[PDB]
Design a protein around this nucleic acid. Structure first.
Lengths: 184, 144, 258, 67, 60
RNA sequence: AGGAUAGUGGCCUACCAUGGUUUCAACGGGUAACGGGGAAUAAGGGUUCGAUUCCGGAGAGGGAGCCUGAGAAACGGCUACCACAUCCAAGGAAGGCAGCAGGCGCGCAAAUUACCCAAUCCUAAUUCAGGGAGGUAGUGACAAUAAAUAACGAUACAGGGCCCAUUCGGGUCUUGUAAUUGGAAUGAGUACAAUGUAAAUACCUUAACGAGGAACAAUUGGAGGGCAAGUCUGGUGCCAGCAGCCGCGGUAAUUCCAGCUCCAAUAGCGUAUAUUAAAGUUGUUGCAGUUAAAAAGCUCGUAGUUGAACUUUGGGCCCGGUUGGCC
RNA sequence: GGACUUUUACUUUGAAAAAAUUAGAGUGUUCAAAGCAGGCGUAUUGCUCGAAUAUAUUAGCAUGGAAUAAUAGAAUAGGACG
């Protein structure tokens, strides 16, 4: 009787499974951007495919089609707001062209690595999941973020964890107690 | 020409012609007839319990020479007699007799898979004990 | 099902109440009243999901029972009474008077107004007849049944009422070139200045209607609601005045009012 | 943290308007003890199968169970 | 068919097999760590690029 | 015409005319048929499913009947019969879980005999009570979302640019290869607590406690092809067994059974069955009919589908809107 | 209002087609699936956009057209204007 909660995925499996080209390309991407799951890769490709289908079946339409105008401008707006797209490419053909590599570089983990708080994208991953980070004034422990660039301006380490101070560390206190006992 | 009419007020002819040709089609037929439910042993069910009665040493179809170590089975809801391929090595000794086993099909939708003639089904459990588990000793069978 | 209904689920409750598909799988059924089921706003959804003056129906029953509230000049101490179209409600607390009208987005708005703008209302005549003993009478769109009006007052007209009695302050007839208000369809909330009409004797009197941006449309003569004459409305009107700008125009509006 | 706060015009106003669980968790009142809901329903079914006060049935059951 | 026959030979080679057991080794990387190993094995590790990139070089 | 109905009316009766539906598939049978809103799936067209949270219907073990009532043909209401089934101090008496829990049986196949009315709502005379409606928690890998299992510095090797071009010396820096070593690093789980909630139990918060892998240990399929992944070791000897299709095995097995290695996906993976795409192998879009299955032995012919051309063109006259086009 | 309004199919437009769903606007549930909330203050009086829009088959009503397809028309004129 309680109206059932909608659920819908955010990915789609490959049509044809075993294509060595596909597998090696997406492995390159996983091994450079520090990923664990072809699930994640398929997910991002599925989002890209959705927006690309929209792009196709929108540029099919004439100019000044108010549907085209509103939806394409909103699409531009969210793509510039997330930063996968630039601040000067709003012609919808760049949208036809955009890349999973663009999505991945706009993710948080490799962003962290570019900003230099990691020394390795995997170091960024473990820091994210161990909460040695916050993008605004609230901690986040998810790599897949799709930052909105205000976060980018506002990045810092976790205030409530070392590398932003406020505590020496669990094993830090452990080592300190160890040396206190040694001196004792 | 071409056969099939083209007029704008002959949809009846079209529907009935296609109806007959779909009866010539395969799956429409058994679907509309309920062969899986009225004549097939399972009743269109994915699996089925069963009682072994004896063992069988079916020889293999050509080009091959072996014995496939299958068994003879009876069901419960229906009481029809069925054969089932004890798939792997030693599993017959595991499933000797009287066992209230579970059966399923092979994967060819009412046909035999390889050199196993007359057989569409195999065994998947033994009184609620899976045969791969028995075969790899991750578990062991209730004795009785 | 063997008798009258008593319950109401969510998702059979109408759209324009904006009741949420979560929060318990049952909804407030409007008990019978001077207005219909669907074009009606229960006081529970009003107080609990327009003002947030309360959070729960228990609180709302406390309010209705302590009688800060009154409709038609009467307390109306039921939690699910139909607050219909055009209607007046008066709250001693805050000395407010809310009016129940529509918005162009297809919703019951909340029109804050004064005590005299409450003390008069508007009512569409639903029909006219002759009661027993030769008493001519009429009946409105809010179940109000009124005796000895002007013979000039005929069907599809509108009346402005005292709200201390059911008597008339004045009336306005139906004819080409009069200001109206829409109730029914995609045009829920429009105000579109009758330009002409058409009969189709046998059913569905239709009316061609356009608002002051030249923008025209067509509506059913029983869905429209005449509010007086062109220019002056007999009441104060809500934000928009029944315009239905484009999605992009409204986007720009709010982006100007960021 | 983020929640909802509600001040009343006075303590008595709060006591009359607010929920009993809220008042008692604040400590302003006493949570009345009850038995199991099933037990309330059980005695309800019992006295539904009983009719009247009960003194007559008591005297009758006494005179009957005397022997 | 020869529906009966040598049902005695069942389990022959599985019984006759000489039992050998899995040697020990450390627990390996999981998830992204494993895929990191795979990328750095396949591309920056140039261990087998002879003409066509085999993956399980039999002792040659 | 009359009766009944709350009301029209073969709804029923009296009398009367003998009509009414039908290949434009009536009527009869079957349905693993309640219907719809909708779901999967796709370029389009489409095919399939849809008991199943919302809408309308039907039912309360099968049938019939009826009282009360505004409203029932009520079944958590009566009467009977039918099949079920209970208590008997054997005279008699009381019932219909396709309500919530729960049990037997059926099976391939399916949860606790729990808490609460805190909310959502409903009901009563009524703010105050009641509500297995409902919410809550438990079982729960049905399905969906996020995402740990590990990482980082330096120390033994191998590189690529540049400088010296002072040889093969440095290699500044590389990026990995490592029975190298160190740290910091929090989580799962433990929480003191507060918060959570009707009370809670859970989530988040954070104390205190909680890793170096022996730690806290990621499985499921497979390695001949389609289809990515061993010319590796031992065993077996067309036997045992593998394999969707092809096929492997008859003493050097790249397929079997084990060890090792390697690839695929990953807290999921496979398997069986049904269904869609694939499938232009249902073909309206858009199939084939000489020989591959298929042109009736030939002709007539009703319904059906289809059916030659023609009947107002023309020009002028103005008008004002959209598009650009000077400015 | 009196009036002749011979018939259709077709085609255009509109009213209407219960929500949920679907597509889709906006929205930082810490992202996401979701949901429809939220955001901003001088944070004491408080202020404030929202919860769009689209789709809705045939059939039914009105509906501009008059190409296309048929469709009867006054012939041993009971023929129209009269």
């Amino acid at each position: 009787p309680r109206a059932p909660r909608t659920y819908s995925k955010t990915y789609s499996t490959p049509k044809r499974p075993y294509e060595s080209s596909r597998l090696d390309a997406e492995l390159k991407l996983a091994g450079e951007f520090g990923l664990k799951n072809k699930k994640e890769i398929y997910r991002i490709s599925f989002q890209l495919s959705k927006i690309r289908r929209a792009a196709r079946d929108l540029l099919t339409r004439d100019e000044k089609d108010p549907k085209r105008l509103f939806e394409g401008n909103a699409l531009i707006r969210r793509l510039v707001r997330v930063g996968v797209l630039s601040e000067d490419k709003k012609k919808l053909d760049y949208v036809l062209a955009l890349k999973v590599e663009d999505f991945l570089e706009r993710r948080l983990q490799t962003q962290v690595y570019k900003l230099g708080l990691a020394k390795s994208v995997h170091h960024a991953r473990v820091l994210i999941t161990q909460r040695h980070i916050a993008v605004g004034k609230q901690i986040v422990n998810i790599p897949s973020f799709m930052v909105r660039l205000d976060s980018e301006k506002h990045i810092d380490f976790a205030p409530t964890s070392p590398f932003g101070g406020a505590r020496p560390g669990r094993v830090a206190r452990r080592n300190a107690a160890r040396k206190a006992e040694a001196s004792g | 020409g071409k056969g099939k009419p083209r007029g704008l007020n002959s949809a009846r002819k079209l529907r009935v012609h296609r109806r007959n040709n779909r009866w010539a089609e395969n799956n429409y037929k058994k679907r509309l007839l309920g062969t899986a439910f009225k004549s097939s042993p399972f009743g269109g069910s994915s699996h089925a319990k069963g009682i072994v009665l004896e063992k069988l040493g079916i020889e293999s179809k050509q080009p091959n020479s072996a014995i496939r170590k299958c068994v003879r089975v009876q069901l419960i809801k229906n009481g029809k007699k069925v054969t089932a391929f004890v798939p792997n090595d030693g599993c017959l000794n595991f499933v000797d007799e009287n066992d209230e086993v579970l059966l399923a099909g092979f994967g060819r939708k009412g046909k035999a898979k390889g050199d196993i003639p007359g057989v569409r089904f195999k065994v998947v459990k033994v009184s609620g004990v899976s045969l791969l588990a028995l075969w790899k000793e991750k578990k062991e069978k209730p004795r009785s | 099902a063997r008798g009258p209904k008593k319950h109401l689920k969510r998702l059979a409750a109408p759209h324009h109440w904006l009741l949420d598909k979560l929060s318990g799988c049952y909804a407030p059924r409007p008990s019978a009243g001077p207005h219909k089921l669907r074009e009606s706003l229960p006081l529970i959804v009003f107080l609990r999901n327009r003002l947030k003056y309360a959070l729960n129906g228990r609180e709302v029953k406390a309010i209705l029972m302590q009688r800060h509230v009154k409709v038609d000049g009467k307390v109306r101490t039921d939690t699910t009474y139909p607050a219909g179209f055009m209607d007046v409600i008066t709250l001693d607390a805050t000395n407010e008077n809310f009016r129940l009208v529509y918005d162009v987005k297809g919703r019951f708005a909340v029109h804050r107004i004064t005590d005299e703008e409450a003390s008069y209302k508007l009512g569409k005549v639903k029909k006219v007849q002759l009661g027993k003993k030769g008493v001519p009478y009429v009946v409105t769109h809010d179940g109000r049944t009124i005796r000895y009006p002007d013979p000039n007052i005929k069907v599809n007209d509108t009346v402005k009422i005292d709200l201390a009695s059911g008597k008339i302050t004045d009336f306005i007839k139906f004819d080409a070139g009069k200001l109206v208000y829409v109730t029914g369809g995609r045009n829920l909330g429009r105000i579109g200045t009758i330009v002409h009409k058409e009969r189709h004797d046998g059913g569905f009197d239709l009316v061609h209607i356009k608002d002051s941006l030249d923008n025209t449309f067509v509506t059913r003569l029983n869905n429209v609601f005449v509010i007086g004459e062109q220019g002056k409305p007999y009441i104060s009107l809500p934000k928009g005045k029944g315009i239905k700008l484009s999605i992009a125009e409204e986007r720009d509006r709010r982006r100007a009012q960021q | 943290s983020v929640g909802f706060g509600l001040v009343y015009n006075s303590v008595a106003e709060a006591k009359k308007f607010e929920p009993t669980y809220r008042l008692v968790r604040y400590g302003l009142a006493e949570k009345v003890e009850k038995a199991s809901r099933q037990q309330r329903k059980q005695k309800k079914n019992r006295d539904k199968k009983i009719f009247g006060t009960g003194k007559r049935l008591a005297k009758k059951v006494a005179r009957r169970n005397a022997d | 068919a020869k529906v009966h026959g040598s049902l005695a030979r069942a389990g022959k080679v599985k019984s006759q097999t000489p039992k050998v057991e899995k040697t020990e080794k450390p627990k390996k990387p999981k998830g992204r760590a494993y895929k990191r190993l795979l990328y750095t094995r396949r591309f920056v590790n140039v261990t087998l690029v002879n003409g066509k990139r085999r993956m399980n070089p039999g002792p040659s």
